[PDB]
Design a protein around this motif. Structure first.
Motif, short mmCIF file in Angstrom:
data_model
loop_
_atom_site.label_atom_id
_atom_site.label_comp_id
_atom_site.label_asym_id
_atom_site.label_seq_id
_atom_site.Cartn_x
_atom_site.Cartn_y
_atom_site.Cartn_z
N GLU A 175 2.78 9.02 5.58
CA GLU A 175 1.82 8.46 4.76
C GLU A 175 1.36 10.12 3.82
O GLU A 175 0.47 9.85 2.69
CB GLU A 175 0.15 8.83 5.76
N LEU A 222 0.43 -1.04 0.12
CA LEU A 222 -0.05 -1.86 0.70
C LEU A 222 1.83 -2.32 0.46
O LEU A 222 2.20 -2.37 0.03
CB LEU A 222 -0.83 -2.68 0.42
N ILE A 223 2.00 -3.10 1.92
CA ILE A 223 3.38 -3.66 2.09
C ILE A 223 3.76 -4.63 1.00
O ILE A 223 4.28 -4.64 0.40
CB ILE A 223 3.84 -3.90 3.18
N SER A 224 2.47 -5.56 0.64
CA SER A 224 2.16 -6.84 0.41
C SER A 224 0.62 -6.42 -0.64
O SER A 224 0.28 -7.42 -0.42
CB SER A 224 2.86 -8.03 0.44
N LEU A 225 1.12 -5.99 -2.34
CA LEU A 225 0.22 -6.39 -2.89
C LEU A 225 0.19 -7.78 -3.91
O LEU A 225 -1.01 -8.34 -4.86
CB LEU A 225 -0.14 -4.96 -4.20
N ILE A 228 2.87 8.54 -5.18
CA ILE A 228 1.95 9.07 -3.67
C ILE A 228 0.81 9.43 -2.93
O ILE A 228 0.85 9.00 -2.60
CB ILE A 228 3.02 10.74 -3.96
N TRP A 229 -0.01 9.50 -4.73
CA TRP A 229 -1.22 9.57 -4.35
C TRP A 229 -1.96 8.13 -3.89
O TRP A 229 -2.81 8.22 -2.62
CB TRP A 229 -2.30 9.68 -5.08
N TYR A 253 6.01 -2.33 -0.47
CA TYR A 253 5.66 -1.02 -0.57
C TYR A 253 5.49 -0.26 -2.12
O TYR A 253 6.79 0.76 -2.08
CB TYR A 253 6.19 0.18 0.25
N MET A 295 -9.93 3.61 -6.34
CA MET A 295 -8.33 4.15 -6.32
C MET A 295 -8.63 4.86 -7.26
O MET A 295 -7.45 6.21 -7.72
CB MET A 295 -7.38 3.14 -5.14
N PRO A 329 -4.66 -1.49 -6.26
CA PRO A 329 -6.13 -2.42 -4.88
C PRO A 329 -6.99 -2.41 -5.73
O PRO A 329 -7.54 -3.65 -5.53
CB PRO A 329 -5.83 -2.10 -3.98
N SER A 330 -7.14 -1.53 -6.77
CA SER A 330 -8.67 -0.99 -7.06
C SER A 330 -8.68 0.18 -8.29
O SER A 330 -7.69 0.90 -8.04
CB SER A 330 -9.25 -0.96 -6.27
N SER A 364 -5.48 -1.48 4.56
CA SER A 364 -4.74 -0.84 5.90
C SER A 364 -4.73 -0.09 6.75
O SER A 364 -5.90 0.72 6.52
CB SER A 364 -3.90 0.61 4.31
N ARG A 396 -0.15 6.21 -1.88
CA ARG A 396 0.33 6.11 -0.25
C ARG A 396 -0.59 6.62 0.19
O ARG A 396 -0.91 6.68 1.47
CB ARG A 396 1.45 6.23 0.20
N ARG A 397 -0.68 8.07 -0.13
CA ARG A 397 -1.87 9.04 0.46
C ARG A 397 -3.48 8.07 1.03
O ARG A 397 -4.01 8.21 2.14
CB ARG A 397 -2.12 10.69 -0.41
N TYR A 398 -3.85 7.49 0.07
CA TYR A 398 -4.98 6.76 -0.06
C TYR A 398 -4.30 5.44 0.77
O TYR A 398 -6.10 5.28 0.90
CB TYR A 398 -5.78 6.09 -1.25
N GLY A 399 -3.87 4.76 1.23
CA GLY A 399 -3.65 4.08 1.60
C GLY A 399 -3.35 2.97 1.16
O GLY A 399 -4.06 1.04 1.29
N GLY A 400 -3.43 2.78 -0.24
CA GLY A 400 -3.06 1.39 -1.26
C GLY A 400 -2.18 1.32 -1.15
O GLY A 400 -1.50 -0.09 -2.27
#
Lengths: 355, 354
Positions: A102, B235-238, B226-227, B41, B71, B67-68, A69, B229-233
């Motif tokens: 974010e 994703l629009i499409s997982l 919430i975390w 998302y 995370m 994603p992992s 991302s 999203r903070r992490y950048g995990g």
């Protein structure tokens, strides 16, 4: 689901976007990919290394790092520069993605503070940048999507790049929509990217891939970025599903940003002719603009609903109420070009009848 | 690297599920219609049914696709540290968060870790009992870095009731949870029900591509989103991971028993070789560690050749230790694809080389 969104979903063509966001987008990217192609492995090996070199080259940077991302990518960038400069303050526009989209990730995950530069409803001015104190990083977003997609002139960017450099401030580009801006600037990705210390680009906005990002910059910067990528849990064993698709939609659409831009300018002209309707900016500088209607969604949604139900053409998929008007964002892609002239002309006459 | 090569160039292996290639994605998608809606998302199509499915499987209130596990688990530790106002957590010295994540937990959060026991074995209940007040104890079933050893279910019960007593949240690193169920003779729900939160993986024993579930109480999962999203995990499409995770879960969910039995078969063959042993001696899962008497210099040539000649892969890398060298074996679909005679001729050649 609301009446407006429903009506837009049940359309057979749209002015905005690329088409439906479905599993076919991935299947299409992979349909000619050999089953025997080896996967990437935790940030190196097959697929990922060539993709990263490719886009280091496209942006004219020493190295590039594939991230899951942009959210992760830009937080990491800012932190690296903050660490390099021993300065925990960064500056950007008040509607910067990191600030509003974010869940405050930057500030929750790093001891970093942000100065919001200028005003929410306009571009920051060169005087406002020159008034900044000693900071680690200025982030620019080209264009400023939250105000409809406005951007400074290329010479203004040159001046900002020299200033920051002469002052020791790192300059980071939020290039989520960089490809979209190249027709208007009349510049290559490297010529724009060359003014900045680091760059983020996305593969799911104008290009219409599935997800994923590239963060590019100096060699040492990217090495550190790879360590933060693992710390964040973004160093997946296998990121090919996004890299192969990203590269495919890149190769597919890299040379269509010009047409998307001309088409957006055409659409804006049609919208601005309508009484009670305007775009911001009035004339797009890219494939995007915001579309404002006087009145609130309770007033305007029914009009659009009817228009859309009848024609089967999607103009507006959602509204956001503001003060005495409501707004939606249009980004032009492959969908518009699949509307024939008679299909555009009939939609727009019906839309003209509503407004 | 020559050994890796010899292994990669084999047409069958005793370890793993086969080649990690693009085919694995295309196989999982062959039967999904092009028109299926993406997730969006963290919500909507694909993701919600998957999360609900895995909440039920784990017997938890809710679950969240990550994603992992890197995370997921960091996020779980922080939520518990916050919920408890306690900035210390505890786990084994070779916990994945301690050694394989570039110190992420401690670099991204004001958290401190206590290491419980000794690197070379399972922690004891008295050692757990000597722990100061902490937000969270993380247990890994099995402890992979020492060969895949795990405490009896009665001991997990004791420990769960103890941490409930002291207000210590208990979290399971269940990257390999499914591989253990055969041994335990328990469901995933029965194991998971001794814990506050649970992480499972879709790329270890199940053999998908990537991705993780974090399951727990409804509140806990809301905050975990919430975390994410903070992490950048977020994703629009997982869906590329989600759909593939499900494909492989469904395909392999009922094969953990045969992987465990097959593991036991392999360790028996290995231990009977002179100059070879496994830890544990008898596997409690699909995995174990394999030790060869002598250094990688002496041993890697012997393996290299056997594999070059046979076209059967036993070993892809050796870690040099004092007087011996080691490697990890995890059984998946590759063992079952080699017929018995083929595995017997491989072992026979191996028997000559040692």
């Amino acid at each position: 689901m609301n009446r407006l969104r429903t009506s837009f979903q049940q359309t057979t063509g749209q002015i905005s976007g690329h088409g439906k966001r479905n599993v076919g987008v991935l299947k299409t990217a992979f349909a000619a990919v050999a089953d025997e192609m080896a996967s990437d492995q935790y940030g190196t090996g097959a697929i990922i290394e060539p993709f990263e070199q490719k886009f280091a080259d496209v942006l004219g940077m020493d190295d590039a790092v594939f991230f899951p991302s942009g959210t992760m990518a830009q937080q990491v960038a800012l932190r690296i520069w903050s660490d390099e400069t021993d300065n925990r303050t960064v500056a950007y526009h008040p509607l910067c993605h990191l600030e509003i989209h974010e869940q405050d990730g930057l500030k929750e995950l790093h001891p970093i503070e942000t100065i919001l530069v200028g005003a929410a409803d306009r571009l920051m001015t060169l005087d406002e940048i020159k008034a900044l104190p000693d900071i680690a990083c200025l982030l620019l977003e080209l264009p400023q999507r939250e105000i409809g997609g406005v951007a400074p002139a290329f010479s203004e960017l040159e001046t900002i790049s020299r200033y920051c450099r002469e002052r020791g401030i790192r300059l980071h580009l939020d290039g989520a929509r960089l490809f979209e801006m190249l027709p208007y600037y009349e510049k290559t990705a490297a010529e724009i990217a060359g003014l900045f210390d680091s760059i983020y680009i996305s593969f799911y906005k104008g290009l219409g891939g599935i997800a994923g990002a590239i963060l590019a910059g100096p060699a040492a910067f990217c090495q550190t970025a790879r360590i933060w990528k693992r710390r964040y849990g973004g160093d997946l064993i296998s990121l090919y599903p996004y890299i192969v698709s990203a590269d495919y939609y890149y190769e597919l659409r890299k040379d269509r940003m010009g047409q998307y831009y001309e088409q957006a300018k055409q659409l804006a002209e049609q919208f601005n002719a309508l009484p009670g309707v305007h775009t911001t900016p009035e004339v797009p500088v890219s494939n995007m603009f915001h579309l404002h209607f006087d009145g609130q969604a309770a007033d305007i949604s029914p009009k659009l609903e009817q228009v859309q139900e009848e024609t089967g053409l999607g103009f507006v998929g959602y509204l956001v109420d503001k003060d005495g008007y409501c707004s939606t964002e249009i980004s032009v892609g492959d969908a518009y070009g699949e509307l024939d002239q008679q299909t555009r002309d009939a939609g727009f006459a019906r839309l003209r009848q509503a407004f």
